[PDB]
Design an enzyme around this catalytic site. Structure first.
Site, PDB file in Angstrom:
ATOM      1  N   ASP A 315       0.836  -1.201   0.000  1.00 56.38           N
ATOM      2  CA  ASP A 315       0.000   0.000   0.000  1.00 56.38           C
ATOM      3  C   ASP A 315       0.864   1.242   0.000  1.00 56.38           C
ATOM      4  O   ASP A 315       2.009   1.188   0.483  1.00 56.38           O
ATOM      5  CB  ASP A 315      -0.948   0.025   1.196  1.00 56.38           C
ATOM      6  CG  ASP A 315      -1.831  -1.199   1.320  1.00 56.38           C
ATOM      7  OD1 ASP A 315      -2.827  -1.302   0.551  1.00 56.38           O
ATOM      8  OD2 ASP A 315      -1.539  -2.047   2.185  1.00 56.38           O
ATOM      9  N   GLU A 352      -0.535  -1.035  -4.886  1.00 62.33           N
ATOM     10  CA  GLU A 352      -1.650  -0.107  -4.759  1.00 62.33           C
ATOM     11  C   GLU A 352      -1.088   1.184  -5.362  1.00 62.33           C
ATOM     12  O   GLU A 352      -0.355   1.920  -4.699  1.00 62.33           O
ATOM     13  CB  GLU A 352      -2.076   0.050  -3.283  1.00 62.33           C
ATOM     14  CG  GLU A 352      -3.069   1.182  -3.022  1.00 62.33           C
ATOM     15  CD  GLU A 352      -3.362   1.425  -1.556  1.00 62.33           C
ATOM     16  OE1 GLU A 352      -4.367   0.862  -1.064  1.00 62.33           O
ATOM     17  OE2 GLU A 352      -2.591   2.161  -0.895  1.00 62.33           O
TER      18      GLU A 352
END
Ligand SMILES: OC[C@H]1O[C@H](O[C@H]2[C@H](O)[C@@H](O)[C@@H](O[C@H]3[C@H](O)[C@@H](O)[C@@H](O[C@H]4[C@H](O)[C@@H](O)[C@@H](O[C@H]5[C@H](O)[C@@H](O)[C@@H](O[C@H]6[C@H](O)[C@@H](O)[C@@H](O[C@H]7[C@H](O)[C@@H](O)[C@@H](O)O[C@@H]7CO)O[C@@H]6CO)O[C@@H]5CO)O[C@@H]4CO)O[C@@H]3CO)O[C@@H]2CO)[C@H](O)[C@@H](O)[C@@H]1O
Length: 637
Positions: A315, A352
């Site tokens: 992320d 991400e």
């Protein structure tokens, strides 16, 4: 963007890891010496990196909180080691469950109490402001009983949060998830779990994005062993488990976090403003620093070895890359990917990334980022646009087809975990609004808005699943069109857990209509398992008719027909195909079990004829009602 540069840089750092450490295997086993360890001789070995400390010490319950009785010995490169000799009576020095703290003394004279960056377990006692560092030395370790499943052909990801996985307004456990949530995931046809919010975060309402202890599995849900049992149980069921890795920033907590560890602003992070993310009020790692590489790479290895995760979702990749591009952040991600895939080629890594960084998901050997997949983030936005800003009659079929087919392997999803949150709408909410609360009961009338909502929820998911990518993702609850929203206990709700839960019982209630959206999901994933469209080459789109609102394509030999028209139901509609012969309905969204009107007879044989239609050699005639999706398989005559 110079691909010859990205490789030459990576290649150099990797060569140095080999000359200076003993290769990336040895380099990534830092968790074996750093931290606090009980030796076979009964003594205790400790190691830390505190470059800006005058002195380092170990204190805790074990020594009656005497801060300076156990001084660490200074070594080269700002590292410190301590060996407490074994007890004369041959008993444990540091008992399991007892509190510990590292004492850092500054040049000024400050006496700082810190939790080791390497800490395995941390607990917040009742209503305490800070987390305590709990020494983890159980009587019995968890022995992994099951082997890693065979690498899936195509990924069907069930994005999960352990805390919210119960109908109760409380933090649900690893044990609850293992017993009650794993069999549901398996039953739906999902073959992969993306485990969110595992890395220790003190702020529950951060959804696992504000990391305090990087080597610690959140205490919140249970003990380290109960997470190991969870992963092992998923493997027993043929389900692979991926972990959400937050290596983009760190919480600015100093008492129970990584910030200001050695007393300075430059330890694991960058000195000054460069080291602070203004929007997130977080610290930013100094990826150029050798010890940050040891820490972050030994963390990746930790989750692979200790908890046996099958891979990761990295992320905040966009935020890592742009401080112009941060070459260090990117070389870190390349080394992380190199490590994951060198240890196990079957291991998966997802990025991400909203930016769409050129070659982020391509091989390192070609100047790529090394990632296996990226998330197809444009798909959830297109559904939002269409439902927010456009009447059904004004939806552009070509725009839907364009957004879904634009492409590097990606993971397709109709709606994100962020869309499930408060002050945002879920697809189910955009489709049914206030009627969701009223007419989701079997006992109430099947209103044209509940009818439209059900039909479109299925269709949006099926076109995203069939055309959108090389993998599929679904966030917990959205498979049955979960009502209301998700919200975590925080100041702004006076610590309410009323929305920090998932109402899974809604699908088991035969007097509710959620069962219909759930049945559709189960059969969509089971059909994917059988035919493998996700692993197949990109679909051949024959029709994207603006007038009729018809999307027609073929993927993995199957014929997909979608009628998005709000009112017109077409009889003897010509759909092109590459295959001659007999065709049969394998999936029909108008089936009763999915909340359709049962307008179609599945026993019907559709015969492909030799008639050129839409750049296809053969064509067949079909009955496709308004807001109905069909999948047709070619069968032996
Ligand atoms: O005899 C003939 C031979 O002589 C010469 O070579 C000698 C060397 O001169 C001699 O030093 C020795 O070198 C060995 C060494 O003993 C081995 O350990 C090894 O060294 C490796 C090491 O094992 C690796 O870990 C790696 O080191 C990293 C380090 O791990 C990493 O943390 C970081 O260190 C920085 C640190 O993080 C910063 O905080 C800061 O440190 C500060 C402190 O904060 C501060 O509080 C205070 O203490 O000061 C510190 C220093 O200012 O900076 C640190 C970096 O400066 O980075 C290092 C990377 O350097 O790599 C090293 C190096 O590979 O191997 C070497 C040999 O390579 O023995 C040889 C001879 O045996 C002559 O050069 C040669 O040609 C002749 O043949």
């Amino acid at each position: 963007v110079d691909f010859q540069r990205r490789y030459k840089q990576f290649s150099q750092i990797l060569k140095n890891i080999g000359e200076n450490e003993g290769g990336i295997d040895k380099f990534s086993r830092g968790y074996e010496s750093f931290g606090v360890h009980r030796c076979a001789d009964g003594g205790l070995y400790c190691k830390e990196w505190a470059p800006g400390a005058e002195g380092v010490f170990l204190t805790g319950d074990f020594n009656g909180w005497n801060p300076f009785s156990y001084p660490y010995k200074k070594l080269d490169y700002g590292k410190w080691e301590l060996y407490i000799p074994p007890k004369q009576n041959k008993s444990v020095l540091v008992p399991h469950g007892s509190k510990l703290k590292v004492v850092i003394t500054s040049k000024s004279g400050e006496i700082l109490y810190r939790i080791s960056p390497w800490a395995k377990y941390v607990v917040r006692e009742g209503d305490n402001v800070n987390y305590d560092w709990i020494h983890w030395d159980p009587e019995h370790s968890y022995e992994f009983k099951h082997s890693r499943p065979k690498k899936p052909r195509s990924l069907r990801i069930y994005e999960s949060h352990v805390g919210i996985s119960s109908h109760e307004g409380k933090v649900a456990s690893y044990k609850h998830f293992t017993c009650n949530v794993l069999p549901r995931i398996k039953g739906l046809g999902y073959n992969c779990i993306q485990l969110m919010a595992i890395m220790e975060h003190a702020y529950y309402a951060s959804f696992g994005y504000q990391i305090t202890s990087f080597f610690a599995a959140s205490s919140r849900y249970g003990s380290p062993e109960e997470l190991q049992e969870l992963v092992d149980t998923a493997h027993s069921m043929g389900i692979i488990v991926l972990l959400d890795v937050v290596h983009s920033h760190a919480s600015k907590n100093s008492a129970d976090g990584l910030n200001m560890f050695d007393g300075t602003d430059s330890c694991y992070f960058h000195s000054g403003p460069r080291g602070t993310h203004d929007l997130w009020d977080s610290r930013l790692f100094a990826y150029s620093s050798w010890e940050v590489l040891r820490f972050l790479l030994s963390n990746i290895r930790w989750w692979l070895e200790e908890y046996r995760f099958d891979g990761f979702r990295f992320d905040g990749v966009t935020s890592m890359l742009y401080h112009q591009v941060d070459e260090d952040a990117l070389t870190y991600l390349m080394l992380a990917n190199h490590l994951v895939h060198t240890l196990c080629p079957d291991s998966i890594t997802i990025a991400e990334d909203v930016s769409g960084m050129p070659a982020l998901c391509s091989p390192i050997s070609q100047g790529g980022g090394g990632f296996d997949y990226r998330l197809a983030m444009a798909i959830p936005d297109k559904w939002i646009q269409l439902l927010k800003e456009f009447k059904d009659e004004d939806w552009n079929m070509g725009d839907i087809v364009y957004t879904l087919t634009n492409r590097e392997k990606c993971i397709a999803y109709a709606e994100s975990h962020d869309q499930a949150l408060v002050g945002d709408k879920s697809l189910a909410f955009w489709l049914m609004d206030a009627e969701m609360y009223t007419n989701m009961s079997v006992l109430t009338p099947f209103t044209p808005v509940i009818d439209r909502g059900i039909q479109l929820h299925k269709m949006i998911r099926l076109i995203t699943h069939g055309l959108g990518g090389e993998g599929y993702l679904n966030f917990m609850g959205n498979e049955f069109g979960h009502p209301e929203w998700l919200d975590f206990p925080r100041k702004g709700n006076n610590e309410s857990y009323h929305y920090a839960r998932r109402q899974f019982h809604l699908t088991d209630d035969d007097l509710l209509r959620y069962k219909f959206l759930n049945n559709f999901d189960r059969d969509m994933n089971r059909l994917e398992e059988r035919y493998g469209w996700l692993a197949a080459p990109q679909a051949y789109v024959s029709e994207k008719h603006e007038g009729n609102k018809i999307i027609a394509f073929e993927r993995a030999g199957l014929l997909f027909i979608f009628n998005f028209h709000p009112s017109k139901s077409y009889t003897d509609y010509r759909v092109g195909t590459a295959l001659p012969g007999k065709f049969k309905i394998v999936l029909d969204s108008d089936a009763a079990e999915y909340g359709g009107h049962q307008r179609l007879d599945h026993s019907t044989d559709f015969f492909s004829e030799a008639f050129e239609h839409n750049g296809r050699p053969y064509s067949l005639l079909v009955y496709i009602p308004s807001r109905v999706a069909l999948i047709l398989q070619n069968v032996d005559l």
